[PDB]
Design a binder for this molecule. Sequence first.
Ligand code: NAI
Length: 372
Amino acid sequence: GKPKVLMALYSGGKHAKEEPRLLGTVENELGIRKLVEEHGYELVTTADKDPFPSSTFDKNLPDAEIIITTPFFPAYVTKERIAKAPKLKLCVTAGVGSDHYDLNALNERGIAVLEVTGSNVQSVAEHAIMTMLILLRNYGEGHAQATQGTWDIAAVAKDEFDMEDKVFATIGAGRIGYRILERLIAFNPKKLLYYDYQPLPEEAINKLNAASKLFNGVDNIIERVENLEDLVSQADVVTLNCPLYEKSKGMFNKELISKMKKGSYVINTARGALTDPQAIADAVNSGHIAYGGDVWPVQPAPKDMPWRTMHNPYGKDYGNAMTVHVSGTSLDAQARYANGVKQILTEYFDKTYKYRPQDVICIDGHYATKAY
Ligand SMILES: NC(=O)C1=CN([C@@H]2O[C@H](COP(=O)(O)OP(=O)(O)OC[C@H]3O[C@@H](n4cnc5c(N)ncnc54)[C@H](O)[C@@H]3O)[C@@H](O)[C@H]2O)C=CC1
């Protein structure tokens, strides 16, 4: 009877009653209901996004003009689902990361795909650093020892290392990847390596070196490596900070992992499909690497997903730092991307269409950025 805004968020349950700041939940609807109903649209919000095609999300596709998803609990907007939404015009991401859309299928229909770029770049950077510290310093066994009542110092320390004088390398030096490099300077790394299809800005290189000089009296800390297999070969820690597209899917396979040093570390706070998931679990279970991160290949992750029971040979709490996808949905980030979805909808409803250039991933049938 009215044009539909179709929104898929994660459930809040009792959590939403104890925290009004849980804006990114079904119960609170990002606080866009007043704006949506002010423009005569219907707002439908569900956490029921799986399975295809019997979910509430599927059953509201026919009349969906706007679809809002969130990457931490993403309704996968596939070719099949696009074909059932004949009046779809706009897809908004409550957050950053639009891998859960079939962007080429949306381009063939001339669909606009909008993110809130930057709303969690610092939130993810913190999560990557946190994961680096947790793995290198063996917080897993150190925290375990405290919880299970023991005091086996040697069991913790034997796999406990300092961040200092380690080689850190990022695959991707974008907004997030560079912010990790910044937060690594004061930890005094041996070297900071990076890999990107483009150079780091002139002026970004000097900023990092300026902090290395200031904090640690070391110049030339940042350095570009051109061969991916070289970059991982020299690194103690590698961070994935690139988006998921066809050429990057599966890039972290058995061949690349095994070209890293034993006892190295892999951090992936970007997208889970950047790895070969079984190759990661195998290398963790064999002790070749430690792995941590918050992004998974399919979200929600199956309960028998190998990453949930990954652990180095030393024990269950070694080399494992998985969390569910939460880094970009911190309470502070939720306020940012809730407001960014509101800005995007206001521009669309008022037919002004003067979206922030960074927010646009796809528009008028062309990928309007190199952010894939
Ligand atoms: N875990 C979370 O909560 C979130 C995760 N992400 C994910 O991480 C990605 C990082 O994006 P941002 O840094 O925010 O934006 P961005 O605009 O800087 O995009 C990432 C950058 O990485 C580089 N890059 C792209 N493809 C690459 C490849 N195949 N290999 C190496 N480098 C490559 C490019 O410089 C690109 O601009 C997002 O696209 C998203 O998939 C980002 C936001 C939230």
